[PDB]
Amino acid sequence: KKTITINGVEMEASEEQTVLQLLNNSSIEVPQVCYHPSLGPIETCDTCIVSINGELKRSCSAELKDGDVIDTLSPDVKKAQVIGMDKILYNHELYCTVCDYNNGGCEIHNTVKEMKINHQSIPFDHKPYHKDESHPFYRYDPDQCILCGRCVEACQDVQVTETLTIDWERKRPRVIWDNDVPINESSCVSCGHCSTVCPCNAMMEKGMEGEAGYLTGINNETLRPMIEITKGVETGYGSILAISDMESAMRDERIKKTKTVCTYCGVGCSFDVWTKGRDILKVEPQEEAPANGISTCVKGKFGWDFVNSEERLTKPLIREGDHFREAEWEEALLLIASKFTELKEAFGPDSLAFITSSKCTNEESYLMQKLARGVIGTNNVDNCSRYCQSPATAGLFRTVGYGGDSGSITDIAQADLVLIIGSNTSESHPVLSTRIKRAHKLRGQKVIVADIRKHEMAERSDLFVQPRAGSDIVWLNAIAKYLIENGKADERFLRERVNGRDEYVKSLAPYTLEYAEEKTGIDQETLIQMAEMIGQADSVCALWAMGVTQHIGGSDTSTAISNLLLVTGNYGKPGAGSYPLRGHNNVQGASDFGSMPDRLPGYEKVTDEQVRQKYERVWGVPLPKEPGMTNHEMIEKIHSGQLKAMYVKGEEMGLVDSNINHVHAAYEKLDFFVVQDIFLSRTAEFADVVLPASPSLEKEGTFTNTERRIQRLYQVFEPLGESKPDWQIIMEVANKLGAGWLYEHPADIMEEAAKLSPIYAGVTYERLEGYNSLQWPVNADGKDSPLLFTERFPFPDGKAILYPVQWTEPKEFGEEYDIHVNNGRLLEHFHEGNLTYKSKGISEKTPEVFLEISPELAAERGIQDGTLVRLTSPFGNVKVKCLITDRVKGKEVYLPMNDSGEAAINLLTGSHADKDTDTPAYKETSAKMEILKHDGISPLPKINHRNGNPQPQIGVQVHKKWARKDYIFPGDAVK
Amino acid sequence: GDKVLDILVKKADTEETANTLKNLLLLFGTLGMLDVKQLEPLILKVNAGVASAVEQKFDIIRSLKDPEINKSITLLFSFLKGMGQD
Amino acid sequence: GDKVLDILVKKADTEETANTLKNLLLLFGTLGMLDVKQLEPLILKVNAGVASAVEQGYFDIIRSLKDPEINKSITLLFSFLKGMGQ
Numbered sequence A: 001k002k003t004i005t006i007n008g009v010e011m012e013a014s015e016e017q018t019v020l021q022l023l024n025n026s027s028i029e030v031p032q033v034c035y036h037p038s039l040g041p042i043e044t045c046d047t048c049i050v051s052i053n054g055e056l057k058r059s060c061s062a063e064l065k066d067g068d069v070i071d072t073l074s075p076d077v078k079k080a081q082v083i084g085m086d087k088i089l090y091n092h093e094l095y096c097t098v099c100d101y102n103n104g105g106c107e108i109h110n111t112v113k114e115m116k117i118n119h120q121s122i123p124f125d126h127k128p129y130h131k132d133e134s135h136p137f138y139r140y141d142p143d144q145c146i147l148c149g150r151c152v153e154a155c156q157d158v159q160v161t162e163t164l165t166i167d168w169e170r171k172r173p174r175v176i177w178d179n180d181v182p183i184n185e186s187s188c189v190s191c192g193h194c195s196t197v198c199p200c201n202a203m204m205e206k207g208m209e210g211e212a213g214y215l216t217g218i219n220n221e222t223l224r225p226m227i228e229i230t231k232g233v234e235t236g237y238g239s240i241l242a243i244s245d246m247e248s249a250m251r252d253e254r255i256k257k258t259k260t261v262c263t264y265c266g267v268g269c270s271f272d273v274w275t276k277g278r279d280i281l282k283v284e285p286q287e288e289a290p291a292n293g294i295s296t297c298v299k300g301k302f303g304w305d306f307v308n309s310e311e312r313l314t315k316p317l318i319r320e321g322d323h324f325r326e327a328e329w330e331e332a333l334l335l336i337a338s339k340f341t342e343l344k345e346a347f348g349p350d351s352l353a354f355i356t357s358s359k360c361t362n363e364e365s366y367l368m369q370k371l372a373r374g375v376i377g378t379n380n381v382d383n384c385s386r387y388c389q390s391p392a393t394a395g396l397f398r399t400v401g402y403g404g405d406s407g408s409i410t411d412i413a414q415a416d417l418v419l420i421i422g423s424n425t426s427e428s429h430p431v432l433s434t435r436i437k438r439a440h441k442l443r444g445q446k447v448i449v450a451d452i453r454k455h456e457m458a459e460r461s462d463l464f465v466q467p468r469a470g471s472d473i474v475w476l477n478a479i480a481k482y483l484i485e486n487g488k489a490d491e492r493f494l495r496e497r498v499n500g501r502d503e504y505v506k507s508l509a510p511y512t513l514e515y516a517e518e519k520t521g522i523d524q525e526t527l528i529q530m531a532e533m534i535g536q537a538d539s540v541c542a543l544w545a546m547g548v549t550q551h552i553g554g555s556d557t558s559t560a561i562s563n564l565l566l567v568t569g570n571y572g573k574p575g576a577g578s579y580p581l582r583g584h585n586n587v588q589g590a591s592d593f594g595s596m597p598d599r600l601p602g603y604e605k606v607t608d609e610q611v612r613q614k615y616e617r618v619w620g621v622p623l624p625k626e627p628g629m630t631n632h633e634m635i636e637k638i639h640s641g642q643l644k645a646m647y648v649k650g651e652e653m654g655l656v657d658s659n660i661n662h663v664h665a666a667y668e669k670l671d672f673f674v675v676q677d678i679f680l681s682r683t684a685e686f687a688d689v690v691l692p693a694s695p696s697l698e699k700e701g702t703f704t705n706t707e708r709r710i711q712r713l714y715q716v717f718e719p720l721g722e723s724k725p726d727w728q729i730i731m732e733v734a735n736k737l738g739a740g741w742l743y744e745h746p747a748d749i750m751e752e753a754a755k756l757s758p759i760y761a762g763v764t765y766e767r768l769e770g771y772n773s774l775q776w777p778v779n780a781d782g783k784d785s786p787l788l789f790t791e792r793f794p795f796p797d798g799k800a801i802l803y804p805v806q807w808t809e810p811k812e813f814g815e816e817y818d819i820h821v822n823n824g825r826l827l828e829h830f831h832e833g834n835l836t837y838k839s840k841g842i843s844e845k846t847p848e849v850f851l852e853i854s855p856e857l858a859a860e861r862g863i864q865d866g867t868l869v870r871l872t873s874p875f876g877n878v879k880v881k882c883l884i885t886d887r888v889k890g891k892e893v894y895l896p897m898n899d900s901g902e903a904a905i906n907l908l909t910g911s912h913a914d915k916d917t918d919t920p921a922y923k924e925t926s927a928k929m930e931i932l933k934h935d936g937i938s939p940l941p942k943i944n945h946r947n948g949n950p951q952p953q954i955g956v957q958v959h960k961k962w963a964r965k966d967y968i969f970p971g972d973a974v975k
Numbered sequence B: 001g002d003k004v005l006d007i008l009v010k011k012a013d014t015e016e017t018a019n020t021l022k023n024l025l026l027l028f029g030t031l032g033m034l035d036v037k038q039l040e041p042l043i044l045k046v047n048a049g050v051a052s053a054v055e056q057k058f059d060i061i062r063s064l065k066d067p068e069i070n071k072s073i074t075l076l077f078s079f080l081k082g083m084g085q086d
Numbered sequence C: 001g002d003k004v005l006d007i008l009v010k011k012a013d014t015e016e017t018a019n020t021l022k023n024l025l026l027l028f029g030t031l032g033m034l035d036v037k038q039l040e041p042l043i044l045k046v047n048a049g050v051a052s053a054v055e056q057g058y059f060d061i062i063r064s065l066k067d068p069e070i071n072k073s074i075t076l077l078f079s080f081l082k083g084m085g086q
């Protein structure tokens, strides 16, 4: 037990580790300028001075012991808090009525107000530094900096970028970027953590500057004397704080704060968008955000410029010969209805394919498949999951039965070991990686990284193995064979919970340590270390991504990961499981709502006569029995005169499908092509009709992230011009064909779909209001499933299945193609950059594509930074500038996807795909390099984050502040 | 307006103008403490003194005894007695 | 406006702010009793004193008293004391 007496009254302490934690739950007034629950105690502000048994101590750090007499009201404790506040006010100038941070949530402002402060003992003295306004997105104002170290704690221990430190050893301490370099030139990855956690305007987003307040637009030349006049005139702090509070209240008229779910990646970050009219002031994250908390990356925090891009499509386009004609919505919808009916009558319903966008909502995916099956009468639906973790879902379907990750991001941060296979986790799922990086950096979590490119996760991993491209299943099978034969497998688990064990051990026969060392290149000794770490860890989370799945044996390698987890007993328990990291913001949800050729919503098979009959009764029409084409297969069927129409929504297929020369050739043949997008994408150029769609900020709906977490979107802006949200468009197209759908809000679409999809039975918009979320399967009672397979596996006998898998040798291109072109993404850029190149701040620090060349290959071919080369494959060629870096080795190069022309990676890639799930093998691309130009400007500027110099450390180093001569603890001011 | 305000604020930025506005606000706070409710009889007496001081034409010793004088000097001494509290 | 007024009234609700407004209204009522019509000569005399004070022990108090300029002022000061008494 733990009984404590606070201010005389005795009470029972629950789970509060610290005194401040108890005081907060008990609703007892105590200043905490530097305490942010997401960061933990820092002990920098010194305003939580309470008396723990007569001793003045900081309550944020004070551990709540049994039988502690804490007092938070005596004159000495209050005199100590005001002393700590005086130093904060000496380092921060209060000018609230004309400050953009005076939005009711300023911790300095409300603490001065809470403490009934009227005078300032230490007058504000300007720091001897200028504002660091070098970065495109945020700025540092050292004069307003209170040296609380909240930004340092976030950069170091939450984000784990380690750019920010405080030079305590300096006469006037200041927040330093790297070894005191300008923000723009530092390793600052622009995540936004430092501005988010800053308790004042010291670290603020440039979007807020001059925009948030009514008097903040006044030029600093006139506003500065106004502040100096007010400072001199001032009778008391409470008088002008009331004036600032009335102005703060007035801001509610202009500034609109709306909850949204990030339109970028599968981490599923939710946050509030602050908008004054159409201007996005700042993306304000909230602690209640289920998947991210206060965490964000550059894309979600600052990459929203595209919504207001002058290039946004605001009117439907109908092709008129050699150009696009702007036409009325009625004529565009009437033409789509006339042509779709024409090809359906003359060539059948199967001569029409439909592509759903994983950028769009769950309801929009549901309506696209309802149009394809219920209206047109074909099963030709699919989404970008085909090029993505389709092999990963095939692997999970074969072994554990659910097409989703085993648990939450919270389970990943809890894991004893995190095995990362073919996943640039800190650049593709940044907020998810912050949990792994923090766990490894502070909790001592073991991190194993299997990859061909040395990225942040590889640099920070406990063990970085580098297997040959496509050999991943060879070492995975060998780890399982060694663990099973050495008796280190979880036999209690394999017993009552798994099937096909003896057939599985028979298939592991060829995968001996010698074979693994021979095929993968990883020595037997390190293979023992991997197996020992995997086996000895109590909880193992296996995170895999496109390095595993974008291969011919991608489905099998994914199955091998699930099989290994079954062997070691890492399922149905917290901190363990299979985590194929879901690509797009709503790839999980687009698949969850039947945007696949083989399955209807809730993953119920199309060929299942019982499932089809359920939908027939509800939809009031017969469903097609035969499955349809995949996203990859669709271009082959256009070429063979089988597919006469394609309705592609929010997918850049003309650049993202493999072998884009063959893709483009099929686009010229195609009878009718409807592209629905927010911009005239590369794909939209090949369209006969382009429909202006509205992005995430201009619509309502739901997204399902990597954790199967259904989250709700609120409308930030009204749809720009005549662009309509995708659901409204799909519905209007269906209505033109006689569907008679009567939805008024996406919530109407969700109610219909929850009744039909069994895994979504209990989902209602009411259960998803605000920051509330539901993880599927959600039964009709509203009870969700945060952690899968706790009681049983979803198979008739409740037991998982070990699935025999073989190594499928990666496709060999030929001896003349000696360069293995590895490809992927960049932290700052999203695919070819239709969204991210509109963000000028992102463009500024990463303006173009580049080809990573190893120092070995650069020495051999005489390559320097900026050397224009020509990678040529049997499918096409790219002309790209070069960048030397030890991230790539030998003859493996790295070509990111951020280019829409000469350097489009999919000009090199081949149409060879996974044998079971048709996922293009993008990580099996070879080419030969021919030098075109020798001298050129480096494609990566000095200001790019990759050209930085992090300063890793544990914490803020508050002990360095206490070591100074000027430091006098406020509590120590007694005599 | 941007220029008019710029000129106005820049000219008022002087510490002489800041003190004028500072003490004007504080003067009202000082007046809030001053019990002007009980000033009514004192103002009527000071009013009667002003009225008699306009009708004009060792004397200090002779005048310090008159019934009219004694009431005023005892009230002046009573005022000094009040200014002896904590 | 509902929030602005809420903040304004809640901050002015202090007894210190109530007294400031109470005595401000009471001050005008006090000024209404004060006969400032007959202050004209007194203000002209106090004005002439301020003017002469700009242009700069025991033995001197005796010498300065009973002087023609002094006698007019001390007799007017005694006449003011005579008025205060009813």
Ligand SMILES: Nc1nc2c(c(=O)[nH]1)N[C@H]1C(S)=C(S)[C@@H](COP(=O)(O)OP(=O)(O)OC[C@H]3O[C@@H](n4cnc5c(=O)[nH]c(N)nc54)[C@H](O)[C@@H]3O)O[C@H]1N2
Binding pocket: A265, A266, A388, A389, A421, A422, A423, A424, A425, A427, A428, A429, A450, A451, A452, A453, A455, A467, A468, A469, A470, A471, A472, A544, A545, A546, A547, A548, A582, A583, A584, A822, A823, A824, A825, A826, A827, A828, A829, A830, A831, A923
């Ligand atoms: N910033 C950003 N984040 C994104 C996206 C984006 O465009 N930008 N896109 C989203 C989408 S749709 C997707 S699916 C996900 C992709 O997320 P990831 O799969 O994490 O991303 P990529 O870098 O495309 O994957 C390639 C990684 O696998 C490694 N690799 C290549 N071949 C092999 C191999 O044979 N074996 C092993 N072990 N590793 C190999 C590469 O070096 C690299 O680390 O990211 C999502 N997140």
Ligand SMILES: Nc1nc2c(c(=O)[nH]1)N[C@H]1C(S)=C(S)[C@@H](COP(=O)(O)OP(=O)(O)OC[C@H]3O[C@@H](n4cnc5c(=O)[nH]c(N)nc54)[C@H](O)[C@@H]3O)O[C@H]1N2
Binding pocket: A263, A357, A358, A359, A360, A384, A385, A387, A388, A389, A546, A583, A584, A649, A650, A651, A652, A653, A655, A656, A657, A658, A676, A677, A678, A679, A681, A693, A694, A695, A696, A726, A823, A824, A825, A830, A831, A832, A833, A834, A835, A897, A905, A906, A909, A922
């Ligand atoms: N060589 C190579 N190729 C790859 C990959 C790789 O690693 N290497 N990765 C593959 C993978 S995993 C994936 S998922 C794909 C990514 O390929 P896509 O899914 O095509 O990806 P993005 O380029 O983000 O395309 C998004 C498009 O949607 C539009 N858009 C954004 N929001 C909305 C909205 O609300 N409504 C509508 N209607 N449109 C919207 C944008 O303007 C843009 O045109 O790339 C694949 N291709």
Ligand SMILES: CCCCCCCCCCCCCC(=O)O
Binding pocket: A098, A099, A100, A209, A210, A211, A215, A216, A217, A218, A219, A220, A223, A224, A227
């Ligand atoms: C969009 C107009 C921006 C130009 C106005 C600059 C003043 C911004 C108001 C923020 C507070 C003033 C900053 C300061 O005095 O240090």
Ligand code: SF4
Binding pocket: A092, A093, A094, A095, A096, A099, A100, A101, A102, A103, A106, A107, A108, A109, A199, A200, A201, A202
């Ligand atoms: S940052 Fe906060 S405390 Fe500082 S001037 Fe702005 S509102 Fe006031």
Ligand code: SF4
Binding pocket: A144, A145, A146, A147, A148, A149, A150, A151, A152, A175, A194, A197, A198, A199, A200, A202, A203
């Ligand atoms: S910049 Fe960092 S130290 Fe300075 S006030 Fe903001 S969070 Fe605190």
Ligand code: SF4
Binding pocket: A151, A154, A155, A159, A161, A162, A163, A164, A187, A188, A189, A190, A191, A192, A193, A194, A195
């Ligand atoms: S990476 Fe940059 S934006 Fe993010 S916390 Fe560190 S310094 Fe701040």
Ligand code: SF4
Binding pocket: A262, A263, A264, A265, A266, A267, A268, A269, A292, A295, A296, A297, A298, A299, A300, A301, A429, A430, A431, A432
């Ligand atoms: S990690 Fe993904 S969801 Fe989170 S802010 Fe970045 S792009 Fe958006």
Ligand code: FES
Binding pocket: A031, A032, A033, A034, A035, A042, A043, A044, A045, A046, A047, A048, A058, A059, A060, A061
């Ligand atoms: S919150 Fe405890 S000293 Fe800052």
Ligand SMILES: [Mo+4]
Binding pocket: A384, A385, A387, A388, A389, A583, A584, A587
């Ligand atoms: Mo993807």
Ligand SMILES: [S]
Binding pocket: A358, A384, A385, A388, A389, A582, A583, A584, A587
């Ligand atoms: S994806």
